[PDB]
Structure formats: C-alpha cells, structure tokens
Design a protein around this ligand. Structure first.
Ligand SMILES: [Mg+2]
Lengths: 124, 180, 262
RNA sequence: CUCUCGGCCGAAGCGUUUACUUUGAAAAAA
RNA sequence: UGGUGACUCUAGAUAACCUCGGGCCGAUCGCACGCCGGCGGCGACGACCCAUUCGAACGUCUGCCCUAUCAACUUUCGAUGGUAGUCGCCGUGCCUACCAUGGUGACCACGGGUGACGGGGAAUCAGGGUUCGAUUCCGGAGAGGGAGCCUGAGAAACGGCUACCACAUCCAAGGAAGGCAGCAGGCGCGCAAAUUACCCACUCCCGACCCGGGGAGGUAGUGACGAAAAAUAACAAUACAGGACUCUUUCGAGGCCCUGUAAUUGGAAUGAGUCCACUUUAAAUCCUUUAACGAGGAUCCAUUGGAGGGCAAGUCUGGUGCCAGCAGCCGCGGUAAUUCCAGCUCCAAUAGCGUAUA
RNA sequence: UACCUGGUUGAUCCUGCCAGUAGCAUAUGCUUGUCUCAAAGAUUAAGCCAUGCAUGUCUAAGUACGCACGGCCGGUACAGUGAAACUGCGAAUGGCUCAUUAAAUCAGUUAUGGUUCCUUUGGUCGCUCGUACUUGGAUAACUGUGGUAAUUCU
C-alpha cells in the first residue's frame, strides 16, 4: 500500500474526447509498478472504469523511488477505439495485426506487375 | 541525413612539457590530498579555471559601464558565488584572478562528505559515494566530482536504503548471520 | 532541380517556429497560400507544438478532418495551411478564438480574443489598380482582391475587413502620428508611433518609430503595419504591449518574480 | 546652409567631389 | 480613371481582324429534402483571364589558388558595335543579311596547371597569421561516354524513349533484353571503410485519399574514428622499519597524530557477472528499477613505453664481445657495456599507450 | 602559460640548419571491465555488377451487368462490399556522388518597367442581341479463337 499516484499538467481535450495528464508514481522499495496496476489506481482516482484508461512512456529515475509517465482517460470505449493508436489498443487486446512481412508483401506486389487483367488475383 | 547531434568537447588540456619535475610534484600533492584517481582529473579542473580566467580578462578590457560587462560580469560572479568558490562580499571582477584550483577542488562531493564526518578519510569517501551510500536532497548521487552547490551543503546524508542508514544489511552480514 | 521542391529540412525551417534538433530530419513545408513560407505558422505547429492539443502529427489530422478549426471563418482541413499575421483561428468545440500577433521577441504569440473581436481583421494594402470597364481593385497582404473600394484608400494603408462578408468597414491612412507594428527585420514585434518617413526614390523608404517609453528605431517601409489611429490600437495587444525589454531589465524583472513567490 | 509652401517647425534644393570615422537597417539555420 | 523616380503603364475611344493543327461563354457528380407544374439549400469536379503563394530563368556591383622556361590575345569559321529581321517564354551576335573596325592587356590580358565543386564552416593561435573544407545545411553538376527527343506547368529526365561508341545478358542462331555515383550485398583496387536485418510506431512526403504507399526516414547489428562519466578496493585491532609531536637533562612513558614487509588477524560494504519480474518499444534489445546467487590474495591478476643526455627514472646482477644489436640527434658495443639480450628494482600516462605519414 | 633544449671547438662567442617538444587527421601495432553520445568504400577505380527491395494512389461525391460475396423484393434502371479495367494525379520531390568546372560555379547586393509559372488563396464565371426534360461514334475490363524458344510481346 506504499505505492502512491499523483497527476499534474492535467487538461481536458474536447477535440479528442479525452483527458490527458502526467503521472508520478512513488514506490520507494519496489520495482517499476505495472501499467495494469497503475490503471486501477486512476480508475478510483477519477471515478471511472479502467477500460478507457491508457498509460504509456513510464521512466524510472536513478536511485529509484519515482517513475514518470503519461496518461489518457477517454469518455467512452468507442471514442478510445476511434482516436487511440492501433498499437496501444492491441496492448489492451482490442486489435490484431496482420501476420505478414514487408518482404512478403513487396515481393507479392512486384509479381502482379507482370500479370495483366483479372489474372492478377490468381498470383502467388 | 539523420536526427543526430555531433556537438561535443574535450574537457582538459595536457601540459606542454611532459617531464617537468616541479609540475609533477605539485600535481601529485593535489592528487594525494583530494584523493583523485589520475592526473587527468587535475587537468580538468585546471582547464575549467583557465577558461574562467580568460573570460574575466576579456571583460576587464571593456568600459566599466559597457552593457556587456555589467551583464556577463554579474552572471559570472553570481555563478562563482553560488557554488561556494568566491565569497559573497568579494563580487568584483578583479577577485576572480585571485582564485585557485584548491578552491574548486574543495567543493567536490568526495571532499564534502569527508569534511562532514560521514567518511573516515578522503579515500573512504570515494568508495562510499561510488557504492551508492550518499544522497543529496532525496536523490542518490554516485559521481565523486559532483560539485556541491552552496545551498546543498546541508542536505548531504546517508541514503535511505543503505546499511548505514535505515536500510537492510548488505549481503555479507545476512550470509554470516545464517552461518551460526 | 527540374521542378519545385516539396520538402523542408528542420534546420532550414524558420527559427521563430522554435523546432528542436532531435525530433526529426524534416519539418512541415507550408502549403502554398495567402502568406509566405518564411512568415507563416502552419496549423500543425500551432495545434501540436503551441497549444498541445495533439501529441503527434497524426492526431492533428484527426482534429482537422472533424472540421473543428476555422481560419478567418472557413474550415481548413489542411494541416500545413499557412496561417499568418492578423489571422483569426476559431475552435468552436472548446469556444476559443486566437489572433496571430507577434510578441516582442519576434515569435507568434498565443493571444486569445473574444468572440466579438473574431468578427474582423486588419489588412494592409499592397496594390491598387483599375480593371476592365474601369473598376478599381485592391490587393492586400492576405492576397484578398477587393473591388469597388473607397478612392481615399491608397497603398500602405490599413483596412478593416468583416470576415463574414469580406467587405471594408473602415480604414486608416499612413501618416505620422499613427500607431504601428513592425512585421519584419530586426524590430519585429515592436509597437510604436510613426514620427518620420525619409524618401529615397529608386530605392527603399525608411520609417522612424518611437515607443511609449521613448525608445526610437527605424525600419523599411515594407515592414510597417499601421494598427490604430494615434495612440489607440484597433486590435487587442499581447502581454508585452510591444515594448522591448533589455536583457538586464528582463533579468531584474525575472528575479523579482521568484522573490515574490513563497 | 538657405530661397517657396502645410499648421515659431517640417516638405524641397545643395555644401566641389571623395577617401576616413561614428551611427542606422539589411544581413538562413546549425 | 488611377498610379510610378521614370511607361511605349492601367483604364478609355475608333476602323477592322480573329488561325479548322480552331478561344472563353458547365450536356459532369453527391447529400438533404422541401415552399407555392414551377421555384430552390449545402458541397464535389472542371473554366479563358486577373491577382497571390512555390519558384524558376536571365541580367547589375565587388570578391578566388599556382604559373612569364606563357606578353601580346580575339577577328577567314562573330571577334566589338550599328540597322532591319529570324528564332526564342522574353532582353540580348542568340542567329542571318548589309555596314563600321573595333574589343582586352604588366592594375598581368591570352595560355597552362590544380591530389580545384563553391560557401556556411574545421584545426592551430599572445597579437598578426598558416593550413583544411569529397562529407548529413544552402547553391551547382552528373547518372558508363557523346548526342537527340516524346509527354507534361516543369526534364534535353535516364528506377523514360531513340541512335552511335565501350562493355555485357538469354537463344532452338530466326531474334529479345541492358545501366547500383539508391538500400543491403559481391568482385576489383588498394595503407585505407559495417547487415543481402525489422518497421511505417516517430519526422515528413505523395495520391482520387481521416483508411493506401515510402531501403525517404526510424530501430536494432558491426564499430578502441572521436568525445563525456567512471571500478580494479575500504576500515579496525595488533607488532614493529619506524616517523614526527608532549613530558622526563638522560634511561622511559606515550591513548595524541602518521606511513609501510605486514606471505599478521577481523568481519563490514559493493558491483562486474548469472538471473524472476516489471519498465522500455510498432515488436524487441540496452539503460533505469527491483527479488535470488555472487570477493581474500598466484584473485573477479591493467596495459603500453622507458631507466647516459635532451627528458622522470639503477656506473645493480648475469650473457655477448665493433659480432648480434641499440640509436629521431649526440652516440653505445673491440672480455670490468649507466645505452644490446634478460632478471630484479625503478617512472611516465593509464582503459589506454606506441609507430608511419599530412 | 606571449616558454625552449641537444649537436660544428683544445676551449669561446655567433650565423645556421638538423634533432628533440605539444595538438590535430588517416592508417597500423599491442591491450581492453562498466556506462552515454557517436563517424564509417571520399582519397585509388564518376571502375564492374549476381540477387531482392527502393513509386504509387479512391472518397458520400468520374465510369460497376465480375453472383466474387452473406443477403433484401421480387415488374422496382441502379440495394451494398468490391477484384479487374477506362479516366485523373504523381512519378521533374527525395536519395547518392564530387568527374567536370578558374569571373565559370558560388557569396553578399540589386533589377525584371525584359519573362514563364501545375497547385493554394481571392476576384471573375445571364456583360455577347445571334434534342435542350439530354445529342454521336467508338474502345477497355469480360467471352471466345490464336502465334512465337523467349519479354510487363501481342
Ligand atoms: Mg634525469
């Protein structure tokens, strides 16, 4: 119960339907606390559900009892899905990337240049 | 084209004569008195003082009411007072030329933690600082060349998480306790 | 080069944009528009870098394509749009209005205005000519072509434009005793009263301007923007009120502030 | 340094012409 | 009418013209649906022209290294100028016809050389100065060497085409296809220089585009180019080579302060490593933060050059004997070598220190 | 930090060079524990290149008769998503290198009253006194027949 959360530089982004802030977490004798653990303490701090809380960029200071990061709280999960980066949604389990490679797609692209017409589709 | 910066400096200058007997004795005395590691640590402070004396000599050739003299003279004097090298009642541009290397070497954290009684010698202070036992204002510092600002002299203490403060004993006492 | 350029390097960007060295190799190249490339503030560097409503350049696009930002009454979805001197930026979602006015250090200021003040702007006069069938035509510093103006308005004057209709409501001539701001050179951002104008035919004129504290300077006639008639400006002014402080005065004024804190 | 004009001052002519000196504005960022 | 320092400017009037290889004057598309069969509101895409933005292109004044064993050069084949025209987006010997005989030069023309792209800048530095700038910013030039074009607002474009010259690829011998001074990579050349890696998450650019693409760019790999910080030990008790310092004249007491063989004792402290986890990140790695393990002495072992002088530090001991070798320079070496080859000891800088060259 | 030292003589004082001394850039030798930043096929060969990649692009809004789709409704011209193809735009930016180049390039300063300009922004777009409630012919994608050892051929 020795981990404490404070926020600063708070501002409400009505243009992106969210609140944004800088988070300082104090944890004098522990390791850097998990982002899932931080997300729950902000849900109680701001009286909302942790489904719309996204935190990132946490750095621990030398010696170590304080970590600084950034935080966003969205009005709704729909607005979060609209405005959030698609890599920060996958961390919460809400986005799946395609399991290919730049080389794979590029080589496939250059093979279809040689083919003309609908026969482009039937090219591997 | 890259988003990189290539600005860097060298922080010392070597002496012109490599085997000057008078300079070899003078520099080893400073090394031994302040517990320094190598001669390069004397040439660094000496370089910093040489650049301070050179700015003062250039300001002293301006008019006494030159706008740049009163702006960058006050700044230099205030900077020298802040770290504790120059006195509060000697803020004149001619008293910079009376400064010495020993004044700058006395404000190191290694010298200060010893002079405050935390360490039993100037070589115990070095290892105490490097082993993460000392803090300045809730921040742990392990750089022996950390120049102590004047209004930081009172906030040099043992670290909160060290065997010499309120922390747990190190690995050796823990291991010997279970030996029996 | 075989044609026009489309990129801008970060060290080659205008210094008053205040861009750091290590964020990227490139800077936003302003789109072609009413204001010059080196005398404008693109919308991305205003929404992201100044107001911090956005953290990345992709978020500026998400604000813009929702049609939230109006530049002088029209929605612009271009994120490198060249806004410039005397423009009015309106964000209706948060109810904010801003005017692009230089501060004493030569940089565009975050100058918030009232909804009433956002209904007009002041425009310098660049060109006057007569077009087909004898119709007088103006061209301003905002690239606005306004026909059938008053015959008393001449080049180097200032007019007031109602942004809803785009018509002239009033004007101020150029003469000694009138307030002005410097919009270029080494006195950029300074406000003072015109005292003299020395004419050099075949070359550039020179205008002498005196501050409220008694400091006098000179500029080229192309760098003078008449603000108000006499001592009274026609627009709201930024915090510094156009007076350039010396470095010693600025140091004393800064040191006095931290002593007040306690 | 001065003849005409706009309400005791300015707008306009140069004093042979320069070199020199001081000032001003104009001079990319790094 | 209006304006410039100055128009052969803008605006106006009149008589005509107006290219078929042709000049503008909307047969285009979406969303909401309505008011009295008519009227309509928001946009999108196109349009001769004017202005504006991004420029580009031509000109003005001053400024560049060495060379006279380059002193006269240009003009037949445009060299300087005039007149009229062609061509060109336009101003001009840009080109043509007819005229005139001009133009530059010791205040260095003309010619030659340059391990010559030019600046912003870099090294050194009492003051003056000397040298460097292929290199990430600005301008120029090129895409094996010349030349010529099509499209287009823009190219004499080369990740466009057409020839020739030099190389070189597949072939059924009829034919077809070429351009890494882009990112990796290979050969060659050399004293001399890294991965055929991951990604569009950042900075930006392009497109019909809030969605697609980007070897631009970012991230890791190699990396003692170079720059910054900083370990390889600290303390206590003993007993001396002992040392100063207080008293005893002296023997001596020293618990007051100091250094060292300490192959003397002693536990206290810590990374470097191994390694849960979190954090970082597009996904990772690293740094930072944290559990567990992790230090006594041939170890968790610091190196590179030297010891006659310049120049800090041994005429120590053993071997060689004008030989082998050292030596930037003076010099050393011919049987007792302060200089070679080694042991010991000593000293200079130190995670760095020698050598060659500019 | 505005600095010198050794070497010509039996010995001396000079001229004068040689050598020593410190930084800085390339290469190289030996050595190398921690951590931050960070140059890197320029020099000679602007020499030659296997292979892969580096330039593409759709909104409500130019053209949809591909059942390619789960699914409406069944006289509905076209419900929607949408491959292909026609059309438009871009590919003249960026990246690389330093061969050429000696009033040439380039830098500061000026002029276009001597030119052009895609696009952005604003103006203009019943100003002309002379089938329209919609005009004509094709050609891609697709179907089908093919040629060549061979191509992003046709
Ligand atoms: Mg000696």
């Amino acid at each position: 119960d020795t981990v404490t959360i404070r926020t600063r530089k708070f501002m409400t982004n009505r243009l992106l339907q969210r609140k944004q802030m800088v988070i300082d977490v104090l944890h004098p004798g522990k390791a850097t606390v998990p982002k899932t653990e931080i997300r729950e303490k902000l849900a109680k701090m701001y009286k909302t559900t942790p489904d719309v809380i996204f935190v990132f960029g946490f750095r621990t200071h030398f010696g170590g009892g304080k970590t600084t990061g950034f935080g966003m709280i969205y009005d709704s999960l729909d607005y979060a899905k609209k405005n959030e980066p698609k890599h920060r949604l996958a961390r919460h389990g809400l986005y799946e990337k395609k399991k290919t490679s730049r080389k794979q797609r590029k080589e496939r692209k250059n093979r279809m240049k040689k083919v003309r017409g609908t026969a482009k589709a039937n090219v591997g | 084209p890259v988003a990189r910066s290539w600005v860097c400096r060298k922080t010392y200058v070597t002496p012109r004569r490599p085997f000057e007997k008078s300079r070899l004795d003078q520099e080893l005395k400073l090394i031994g008195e302040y517990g320094l590691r190598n001669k390069r640590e004397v040439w660094r402070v000496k370089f910093t003082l040489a650049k301070i004396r050179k700015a003062a000599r250039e300001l002293l050739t301006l008019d006494e009411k030159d706008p740049r003299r009163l702006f960058e003279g006050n700044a230099l004097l205030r900077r020298l007072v802040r770290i504790g090298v120059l006195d509060e009642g000697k803020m004149k541009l001619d008293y910079i030329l009376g400064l010495k290397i020993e004044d700058f070497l006395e404000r190191r954290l290694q010298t200060q933690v010893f002079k405050l009684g935390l360490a039993k010698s100037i070589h115990h202070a070095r290892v105490l600082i490097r082993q993460r036992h000392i803090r300045v204002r809730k921040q742990v510092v392990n750089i022996p060349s950390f120049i102590v600002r004047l209004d930081s002299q009172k906030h040099i203490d043992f670290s909160l998480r060290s065997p010499y403060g309120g922390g747990r004993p190190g690995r050796v006492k823990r291991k010997n306790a279970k030996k029996g | 080069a075989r044609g026009p350029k489309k990129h801008l390097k970060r060290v080659a960007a205008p210094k008053h944009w205040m861009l750091d060295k290590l964020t990227g190799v490139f800077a936003p190249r302003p789109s072609t528009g009413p204001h010059k490339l080196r005398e404008c503030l693109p919308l991305i560097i205003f929404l992201r870098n100044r107001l911090k409503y956005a953290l990345t350049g992709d978020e500026v696009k998400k604000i813009c394509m929702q049609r939230f930002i109006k530049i002088d009454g029209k929605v612009r979805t271009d994120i490198t749009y060249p806004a410039g001197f005397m423009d009015v930026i309106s964000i209706d979602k948060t109810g904010e209005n801003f005017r692009l006015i230089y501060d004493t250090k030569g940089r565009f200021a975050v100058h918030r205005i009232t909804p009433e003040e956002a209904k007009y702007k002041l425009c310098k006069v660049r060109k006057i000519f007569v077009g087909t069938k004898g119709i007088p035509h103006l061209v301003t510093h905002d690239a606005r072509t306004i026909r059938y103006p008053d015959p008393l308005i001449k080049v180097n004057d200032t007019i007031q434009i109602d942004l809803e209709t785009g018509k002239i409501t009033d004007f101020i001539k150029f003469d000694t005793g009138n307030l002005c701001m410097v919009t270029g050179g080494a006195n950029l951002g300074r406000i003072g009263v015109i005292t003299n104008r020395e004419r050099h035919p075949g070359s550039f004129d020179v205008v002498h301007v005196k501050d409220a504290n008694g400091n006098s300077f000179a500029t080229r006639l192309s760098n003078i923007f008449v603000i108000g008639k006499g001592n009274k400006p026609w627009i709201s002014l930024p915090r510094g009120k156009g007076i350039r402080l010396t470095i010693a005065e600025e140091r004393d004024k800064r040191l006095a502030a931290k002593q007040s804190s306690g």
